[PDB]
């Protein structure tokens, strides 16, 4: 029986959810495509159903969004920022139940579910002010009586494809900034977080309808692979923002490039921690634990590779092993719990395979490596030592709490080993040596977009620039 | 016999050119690939030869550039700007002979050849100041004792592929900004402007060498499609700037994306002029003429489509026919010619093809349309009427002076017609109606990246990589 | 008897007001200086009393604010922005009663009173985002291993002196931006809007107190010229923001400069409207009316001079006379009135003085010019013609609805006439001539800081101090 | 006899100088005011004469500058930047003789005279690019169909008053930026550097005349106090840039404020060096020597107060004393010399008085303190120890090489002592302690505008901003 039909989950109805939910919103709610059931990863029980977009739904929705844009693009940016402010306030009102739904359907602990909704709220609060800052300079022409104007306009329709692990806030960022920039949006979320997508869209739709705005400004088309591919290939989708796996993202980027569209790609990858000989272990161990096991190792920034100096290697591994043992585990929406399940059964399979492949490559499991004997998709947070830095399994990005630990002797080699990684998303170093930090942050250092040490024009990405020369 | 071997062309030696020139520079000059002879389009005589890059040349050069980068990236941005300043000074010193070479090998008139070198000089002067402005903010973190730093670093090696029609200044822009940003560069110019590429590289090389810097900071590998494709597929080329045809550019773009590299593409597109009923004809006619026939119609920005209201379509065409009659065509060194030869014999064939194809699709040639019976690649400035706004030949960007003219009734018509084209390059409107102007420049107006009205500073971030660095100083 | 003691005014207690209120806040409420009773200008009845700051109160408060700063300056800018966000939320919660108080004590109509509080709310919402944007660049030094950092720090204590006509939002802007910049503030509002200042401070104080922050971050010392002068001469007041009359502001400016402090002065100036011969009268007449009589002519931006071409001077005045006849004047709480009473009885006297003085200088009162025979400070919306553009009374900024009208022949005349005034505040032109518009907005046009055409993000740097920090990391 | 009449100084004629020089330039050269003779401080010999502006000259020049502005303001900013580029090139051509004149008339060593001309060249090279960056954004209005434009216009006439110690490059900065911003300028330099002012103005005037521009765009009115005061009180001088002493500058600022004008004031003051216990003395001593004795202690940034930790105090003083002894002294234009004379006889008097007052306040002269027995205005570079931090003589800014040395025990006190100074121009700390550097650079640290550790919108200052709201 569906969780939403059990009295103990009656709070779900506060988000306007029912047994079967419309998964298409374009000003009207509908869905003639396949009906999907999503499941709670903490107990593998069905929660509720969503009727996804058909091809026809997608086509209709794109057309309606583009018609809505004619109205929306004419609303001045600060007034669009006011609408985004109101979306923020509406999320505020629902933050506990929406955060609870994030934990229920996705599996991250309650403080993280609520925190993700809060992030979207904070983004909306930020966008309000940013909406008053959109514009380009009037530059002087070389010719007298001529004006040189850097003009910024909406791109039109921004399609947004998001992933399971941040099913609210990635959409939130894209939506908020695309909206103040005068674009309309079309959201396709992860199918396994469809209820979350629907719940967020219901909140936004009410704000739009209360303001007598066409709902298709924030359209929703729940669906699987065929909907995502359609967006990628659709010339009417002026900008496609994709967050997800590298394999899918690469193909999305190629499809967009083939039709001369624009894309924003967040593909994540491997994240490394490097603890040098002089690191403060009081920081390294709790940092590595949180970065490794937080959200059950399913973050884009999850630490999967830990490089430790030979001297402190064993102590750090020991203290990690001790730290891992005291990790509290349960239903993620129970305020007591610190560690929840993996998002799907498939991820549990990937976890087991990764552990096996790691052993078959020469690694020793010094902690965990097993599925937990309990309902749901729970696995033990795992530490593997003895692997070689060039190990194939280590370079692959399995969304599971497996920490691969590598030793090193000097700065030169470990820096080389890391710069040999391409997909690198973030690098976190722990050292007290200043010259070393500079080298790692500078031109010859990390290639990562995010670098951490011992721990503004974003709107232009959603607009198109023109140079306008005007003769008085 | 080679022009460079004739006494009257002895000035070419001021640019360090000889009968057979090395087309590879990486700190040393060389070239083991295929020879190419380039020709003067004014008389179709061979100028001199360049030995292009082999695969081994390319490999060695990419390696030397990346080694050079280790030194160059450590030189403070303002010191890099001083080098670029010296490059501008060195170009100044050679501006007349380098300008004359552009005219000799590529075929644009001398004021434009010199003017193109001057643009590169002005870019270097600009880059000097810009080099003191490169960096990102330190922002306060929400967490006490933490700092958020927006860090900008060089991408590494910037490959630069350029086209025949601006064989100096496009490279110049890319080179100057890439340099101050701490990158090293690798240039592959158009094969038919190989001498120009060598001459520019000789000028830059001497500045680098005089400053005791590794010359591969500004490397050159002359070649054709094979070198260009190698660069596009090469992971060591961190950023690839391409200027040229849409067909080639699209392939280059896909290859770079396949390896998750970075590209900057300039693929051009068509350029339209729209004269409304209330347009000042005093502006419309000369603006259209110069935009259409400047550089013999071989600019990226060349106007190839002129929409005129049914109202004044008849008159503007008549006034254009009379004005076109007075266009003087001739040798690029002649101070009294408006434009010179097409760049290639092939381009002349393309001109004749477009003219005939236009006729087959119902067009009337109301002026020009013929090849001039004289040595070189000279064609008449041409105007074609009666075509439909969707005629497949008018949307083809023929690099020749062919101006297609269309009539229209309403603003809604012509605006739809014009935004039916796939990402045109520039739109130039002539009107007095200020509401129409706000419309055309606004969100529901032209999709072109260049819009002009009554006429025919963060750029460095494109050449760098951003990181967000969070530092716990508590 | 005090309005606040009458049952129908019991809503004032929602703002924490009583019969006699403390006018000093520095974390605790107090006030040992002189009492002041403020009056409702709609009926000239006393509302309630405020005990103002003594010298001892001021001293203690400045000391407590500077002690509070030691804590506040260490709170990360985005965390400071979250406090300002909460202040905006707290204002929202009280917007109707706080708006009603602005209308009750100051006299502007309720939609403007509420609208003024809404502006402060919108400013707080804006400041939240701006707080994440505060900082300067790290630039590369010309010297290897050296870094150039543009560092921004709070100035310390920001004194804020505000005027009667916007007794909430001017303080709000200064307070919100000063706060996110890491400064503490000290407010001295207009004496005749003391209850408003106390009410706003009570709202902010609760947010600070609830957040366990020292309340003197947003201190209040109610007083008159003596407190204002103390702030101007006080070295501990690092930055003094003053809004008010030019005469007072100039003195304040000189006092601050004498001690090498920093000031921000808003001194207003006149506001002119220029309707040319080609002006759309459909715009001119209502724009002029609303600009002239909005808030009973008591805005800094109130239009007091209307220049009209000799061409249409006759008609626009006639159409204005008819429109003025339909202006409804009455109680600020009445939703169907365009404006209410003047702020003070003295202002009514000033109105009559200007009207008579105008007549003595040759002016014709073509509409209004009288005091309305009813309780409160009500005057008729007034239009005066026949004055010369240099008449000394028309250049006086009388805070009352008096509109002086002048005719002119040529553009050169009216532009000279208008830029003869000493730094006017705003210029609003109505014309179709686009060249005239470029002229008026350009280097040889208006010197006003506000220019409007066919209508009547680094700001945080003003509240901080910049340092260039060079660090040898080699 | 005048130096310019001696064959050995015939190189002066390369700058267009003669026995008596016109000190007014407004497109024509003139001067009906007082005739001044300037003197070489290395030998107290007269160099040449300059006929200064009368009141009438000043009045005429202001009017002509303002007429020239009508033409100049209509030249697009990048074309104005080209004129500034050409001024740069023209200085380049004269750099050796102009630098030599700086050494001759002002007294700073040759490398510094040439270096100051080079700074102006570099400023011109910078201004060329900056000229393409002048403008404000078009921001979105809250009202539909309305445009919000941040407009920047020239202020008009920028008066520039400069001092003896940087008689070329301060004017150069003001001139170059004011020019690209579309302003005309009026220069009044230090009377004791009048030949330098004339020589620079001749270089600029030729560039303007070659370009068929009205010379008054860069006007010159040489004069003393009455000319400076006239500029300060003149409503036609829209912006007054003053560099000089605090007493004069304060009065200039008050005069400008009285008439609601705009001013830019550079008043300099005291500069302190703080060497903590952990400082690298290998840096501290040569840094202190150069900052103290460079340009004979006549820089705006000259170090006059040295705070040293008790532990290293004596060693640093010793090594300074040893370093001071090997200082090479001679004619400043002789390429061999490292230390020249003070700029005037009056400064030598101030030097002697400061030394005497320092003794009478309790200080010990551990080196120097005497005038040198030789022609010119030469004094010994001086180190005074034993003074109290609150000493009156130490807080005063005498343009002479007197280094006052103070001891301290801990961070708290020395920071307090320094924050007790108001006029503080720069602060230079030497320490390896990171927390300490942060404290000194942060909100609770130095109040100085320039802070050194172990060693862009400038155009807006010369323009006026308006907010322009336009209804389509
Ligand atoms: O005009 P074009 O696009 O045919 O040429 C523009 C530039 O691209 C180069 N080029 C031609 N074919 C290429 C290819 N297949 N890949 C990369 N570059 C190529 C040319 O040599 C020229 O420099
Ligand atoms: O309109 P106004 O300028 O007379 O008043 C504006 C503000 O300045 C204050 N003020 C009045 N006299 C002052 C003075 N001498 N110094 C400083 N502030 C003063 C007022 O109290 C008010 O808050």
Cα C252 to the center of its chain, rounded Å: 16
**By the CB < 8 Å criterion, does B71 face chain A?**
no
| Nearest-CA distance D181 → chain C (Å) | 11
Q: How many CB atoms lie within 10 A of CB A365?
A: 17
Task: Annotate C163-176 with b (16+ C-beta within 10 A) or e (fewer).
Answer: bbbbbbbbbbbbbb
Q: Which residues of C touch D257 (CB under 8 A)?
A: 250, 253-254, 257
CA D421-D427-D429 angle, to 5 degrees, is 125
List the single residue in D with minimal CA-CA distance to B133: D456
Instruction: Please say whether the beta carbons of A342 and A379 come within 8 A.
Output: yes
Among protein residues, the one with the nearest Cα to ligand 2's atom 12 is C225
**By the CB < 8 Å criterion, does B336 face chain C?**
no
Task: Annotate C425-453 with b (16+ C-beta within 10 A) or e (fewer).
Answer: bbbbbbbeeeebbebbbebebbbbbbbbb
| Nearest-CA distance A133 → chain C (Å) | 7
What CA–CA distance (Å, rounded) separates B51 from B36? 6
- Check C453 against D470: CB less than 8 A apart: yes
Instruction: Please say whether the beta carbons of D405 and D390 come within 8 A.
Output: no
Task: Annotate A115-145 with b (16+ C-beta within 10 A) or e (fewer).
Answer: bbbbbbbbbbbbbbbbbbbbbbbbbbbeeee
Cα A2 to the center of its chain, rounded Å: 28
Q: Which of C129, C435, C438 sits opposite A126 (nearest CB)?
A: C129
**By the CB < 8 Å criterion, does D144 face chain B?**
no
Q: Which of D129, D438, D444 to mutate to test the interface with B (most CBs of B within 10 A)?
A: D129
Please list the helix, strand and coil fractions of chain B in percent, rounded to the nearest 5, in that order.
45, 20, 35
Q: What are phi and psi of C194, to 5 degrees?
A: -60, -40
Q: Distance from the CA of C226 to the center of ligand 2, in angstroms? A: 9
| Ligand 2 pocket, CB under 6 A | C 161-163, 188-191, 224-225, 228-229, 232, 244-245, 248, 251-252
List beta partners, residue C159.
C186, C240
Q: Distance from the CA of B418 to the center of ligand 2, in angstroms? A: 61
**By the CB < 8 Å criterion, does C145 face chain D?**
no
Instruction: Please say whether the beta carbons of C117 and C102 come within 8 A.
Output: yes
What CA–CA distance (Å, rounded) separates C25 from C202? 9
List the single residue in D with minimal CA-CA distance to B89: D89
Instruction: Please say whether the beta carbons of A402 and A293 come within 8 A.
Output: no
Instruction: Look at residue C77 and give its three-state secondary structure.
Output: helix
Q: Which residues of C touch B464 (CB under 8 A)?
A: none
Q: Which of A232, A225, A234 is nearest to A191 (CA)?
A: A225
| Nearest-CA distance D129 → chain B (Å) | 4
Tokens 């220029």 sit at which residue? C274
List beta partners, residue B266.
B243
**By the CB < 8 Å criterion, does A71 face chain B?**
no
What CA–CA distance (Å, rounded) separates D203 from D28? 14
Residues 6+ apart with CB under 8 A from B239: B155, B156, B157, B158, B159, B178, B183, B261, B262, B263, B264, B463
Among protein residues, the one with the nearest Cα to ligand 2's atom 23 is C190
DSSP D290-325: HHHHGGGG-STT---EEEEETTTHHHHHHHHHHHHH
Q: What are phi and psi of B266, to 5 degrees?
A: -115, 105
Q: Which of B85, B131, B138 to mutate to test the interface with C (most CBs of C within 10 A)?
A: B138
Interface chains of chain A (3 or more CB pairs under 8 Å): B, C, D
Sign of CA dihedral A272, A278, A283, A286: positive
Residues 6+ apart with CB under 8 A from A194: A21, A23, A36, A38, A50, A52, A222
Q: Which residues of D touch A151 (CB under 8 A)?
A: 138
Interface chains of chain C (3 or more CB pairs under 8 Å): A, B, D
**By the CB < 8 Å criterion, does C451 face chain B?**
no
Which segments of A351-471 are extended strands (E)?
364-367, 382-385, 402-408, 426-430, 450-453, 463-471
| Ligand 1 pocket, CB under 6 A | B 161-163, 188-191, 224-225, 228-229, 232, 244-245, 248, 251-252
List the single residue in D with minimal CA-CA distance to C439: D74
Kindly list the catalytic residues of C: 266, 300
Q: Which residues of B touch A456 (CB under 8 A)?
A: 137
- What domains does chain A contain, in order, with CATH numbers? 1-268+456-472 (3.40.605.10), 269-455 (3.40.309.10)
- Check D142 against A74: CB less than 8 A apart: no
C-alpha separations of A342 from A46, A293, A354, A404 in Å: 16, 11, 14, 18
Among protein residues, the one with the nearest Cα to ligand 2's atom 13 is C225
What CA–CA distance (Å, rounded) separates D301 from B285? 62
What CA–CA distance (Å, rounded) separates B457 from D456? 11
Angle between helices C169-180 and C77-93 in degrees, nearest 10: 150
Q: Distance from the CA of B237 to the center of ligand 1, in angstroms? A: 16
| Nearest-CA distance B348 → chain D (Å) | 39
Q: How many CB atoms lie within 10 A of CB A271?
A: 25
Q: Which C residues 271-290 touch D at CB under 8 Å?
A: none
List the single residue in B with minimal CA-CA distance to A154: B443
What CA–CA distance (Å, rounded) separates D430 from D307? 10
Q: Which of A136, A455, A457, A460 to mutate to test the interface with B (most CBs of B within 10 A)?
A: A455
Kindly state the helix (H) or strand (E) to which residue C38 belongs, with its residue range: strand C35-40
Q: Which residues of D touch A81 (CB under 8 A)?
A: none
Tokens 């506990």 sit at which residue? A96
Q: What are phi and psi of B169, to 5 degrees?
A: -75, -30
| Nearest-CA distance C380 → chain D (Å) | 30
Q: Which residues of B touch C154 (CB under 8 A)?
A: none
Tokens of B191: 């094969």
Q: Distance from the CA of B224 to the center of ligand 1, in angstroms? A: 7
What is the DSSP code (8-state) at residue C8?
Answer: G
Q: Which of D443, D460, D470 to mutate to test the interface with C (most CBs of C within 10 A)?
A: D443
**By the CB < 8 Å criterion, does A119 face chain C?**
no
Q: Which of C387, C425, C383 is nearest to C400 (CA)?
A: C383
- Check C137 against B138: CB less than 8 A apart: yes
Q: Which of C165, C196, C225 to mutate to test the pocket of ligand 2 (most atoms within 8 A of CB)?
A: C225
What CA–CA distance (Å, rounded) separates A38 from D180? 65
Instruction: Please say whether the beta carbons of D399 and D297 come within 8 A.
Output: yes
Q: Which residues of D touch A456 (CB under 8 A)?
A: none
Q: What are phi and psi of D6, to 5 degrees?
A: -95, 135
Q: Which of C127, C129, C438 sits opposite A472 (nearest CB)?
A: C438
Among protein residues, the one with the nearest Cα to ligand 2's atom 4 is C245
> Using what technique was this structure determined?
X-ray
Kindly state the helix (H) or strand (E) to which residue C428 belongs, with its residue range: strand C426-430
List the single residue in B with minimal CA-CA distance to A235: B422
Q: Which of B126, B434, B438 sits opposite D128 (nearest CB)?
A: B126
Kindly state the helix (H) or strand (E) to which residue B186 belongs, with its residue range: strand B184-188
CA atoms within 13 A on the CB side of B189: 33
Q: Is A27 left (phi over 0), alpha (psi -120 to 50) or beta?
A: left
């Amino acid at each position: 029986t569906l969780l939403i039909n059990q009295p103990q989950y009656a709070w779900l109805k506060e988000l306007g959810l029912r047994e079967e939910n419309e998964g298409v919103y374009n000003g009207s709610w509908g869905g003639r495509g396949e009906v999907i059931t999503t499941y709670c990863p903490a107990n593998n029980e069905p929660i509720a159903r969503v009727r996804q977009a058909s091809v026809a739904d997608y086509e209709e929705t794109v057309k309606k969004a583009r018609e809505a844009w004619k109205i929306w693009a004419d609303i001045p940016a600060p007034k669009r920022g006011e609408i985004v402010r109101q979306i923020g306030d509406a999320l505020r009102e629902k933050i506990q139940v929406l955060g609870s739904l994030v934990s229920l359907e996705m599996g991250k602990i309650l403080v993280e579910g609520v925190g993700e909704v809060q992030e979207y709220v904070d983004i909306c609060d930020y966008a309000v002010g940013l909406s008053r800052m959109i514009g380009g300079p009037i530059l002087p022409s070389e010719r007298s009586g001529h004006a040189l104007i850097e003009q910024w306009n909406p791109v039109g329709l921004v399609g947004i494809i998001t992933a399971f692990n941040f099913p609210v806030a990635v959409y939130g960022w894209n939506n908020a900034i695309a909206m103040i920039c005068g674009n309309v949006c079309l959201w396709k979320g992860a199918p396994t977080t469809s209820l979350i997508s629907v719940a967020v869209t219901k909140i936004i739709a009410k704000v739009l309808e209360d303001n007598k705005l066409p709902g298709a400004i924030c359209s929703l088309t729940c669906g699987g692979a065929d909907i995502g591919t359609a967006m990628a290939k659709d010339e009417r989708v002026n900008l496609l923002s994709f967050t997800g796996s590298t394999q899918v993202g690469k193909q999305v980027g190629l499809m967009v490039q083939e039709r001369f569209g624009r894309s924003l790609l967040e593909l994540g990858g491997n994240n490394a921690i490097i603890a040098f000989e002089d690191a403060d272990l009081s920081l390294v161990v709790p940092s590595a634990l949180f970065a490794a096991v937080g959200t059950a190792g399913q973050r884009c920034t999850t630490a999967r590779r830990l490089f430790i100096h030979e001297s402190i290697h064993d102590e750090v591994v020991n203290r990690l092993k001790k730290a891992y043992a005291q990790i509290r585990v349960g239903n993620p929406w129970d305020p007591n719990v610190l560690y929840g399940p993996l998002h799907t059964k498939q991820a549990v399979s990937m976890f087991l395979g990764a552990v096996e492949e790691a052993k078959k490559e020469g690694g020793t499991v010094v902690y965990g490596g097993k599925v937990m004997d309990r309902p749901g998709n729970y696995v033990e947070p795992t530490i593997v030592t003895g692997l070689g830095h060039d190990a194939s399994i280590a370079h692959t990005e399995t969304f599971a709490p497996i920490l691969y630990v590598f030793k090193f002797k000097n700065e030169e080699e470990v820096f080389a080993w890391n710069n040999e990684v391409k997909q690198g998303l973030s690098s976190s170093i722990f050292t007290k040596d200043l010259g070393r930090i500079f080298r790692w942050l500078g031109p010859k250092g990390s290639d990562c977009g995010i670098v951490n040490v011992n721990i503004s024009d974003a709107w232009k990405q959603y607009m198109r620039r023109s140079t306008c020369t005007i003769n008085y």
